[PDB]
Structure 1
Amino acid sequence: SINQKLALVIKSGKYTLGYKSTVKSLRQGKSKLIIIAANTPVLRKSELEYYAMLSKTKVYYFQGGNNELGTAVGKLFRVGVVSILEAGDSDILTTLA
């Protein structure tokens, strides 16, 4: 049920795809949720978790690799991490999952 929430965010809201822009939004305190692919390297996901704890940001662990996270965000390339900057009429933010 996360694929449709993510797709409606992609349709209506604002997001960044990728480690560098995700970390940039985390320091600027613009992210409200980060989705991390399952095959993300553990050092990278630990550092994203640290950044999220410092910025008081929600973390969601996508049950899938970067290939189908990229598929889930309507993309033809691999995305390791997604950051939501402001969700539209989606309930992905208020939903715990």
Structure 2
Amino acid sequence: ESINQKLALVIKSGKYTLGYKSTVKSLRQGKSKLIIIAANTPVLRKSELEYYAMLSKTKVYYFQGGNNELGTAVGKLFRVGVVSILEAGDSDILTTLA
């Protein structure tokens, strides 16, 4: 499974949140278990979500496509840089590594 297939399942039973400030919260306190980082996410602010994730030792999914492919997988128009997955729910993203 690719994570964009499983993102539609996070919407229902699980919880996600989008944003730089939203992911900054979630890596510092550690409410996110798995973040997603896209391709064309801005210069400084992308690197910090890699940093804080390695620091707290929260997991990072490095994405295949760009911000448009990531944004359509959740559901807004804008160039979604990150998706912070708090709870999985219906998503089979846990049992990818078994």
TM-score category by the smaller chain?
0.7 to 0.9
Q: Distance in 2 between matches of 1:93 and 1:83?
A: 15
Q: Distance in 1 between matches of 2:74 and 2:8?
A: 6
Q: Distance in 1 between matches of 2:37 and 2:71?
A: 11
Q: TM-score, normalised by structure 1?
A: 0.86
Offset at residue 21 of structure 1 (A): 0.4
Q: How many pairs are equivalent?
A: 97
Q: Distance in 2 between matches of 1:29 and 1:94?
A: 21
**What is the percentage of aligned positions where both structures have the same residue?**
100
Q: TM-score, normalised by structure 2?
A: 0.85
Match of 2:82 in 1: 81
Q: Is the 8 A contact 1:31 1:84 kept in 2?
A: yes
The RMSD of aligned alpha carbons is 1.9
Q: Distance in 2 between matches of 1:2 and 1:81?
A: 12
Q: Distance in 2 between matches of 1:73 and 1:86?
A: 14
Q: Distance in 1 between matches of 2:42 and 2:58?
A: 20
Unaligned runs of at least 5 residues, structure 1 = none
Q: Over residues 19-57 of structure 1, what are the superposed CA-to-partner deviations in whole Å (9 max), with x where a residue is unaligned?
A: 110111111110001101111134333211110012111
Q: Is the 8 A contact 1:32 1:93 kept in 2?
A: no
Q: Distance in 2 between matches of 1:15 and 1:87?
A: 8
4+ aligned runs moved over 6 Å, structure 1 = none
Offset at residue 65 of structure 1 (A): 1.6
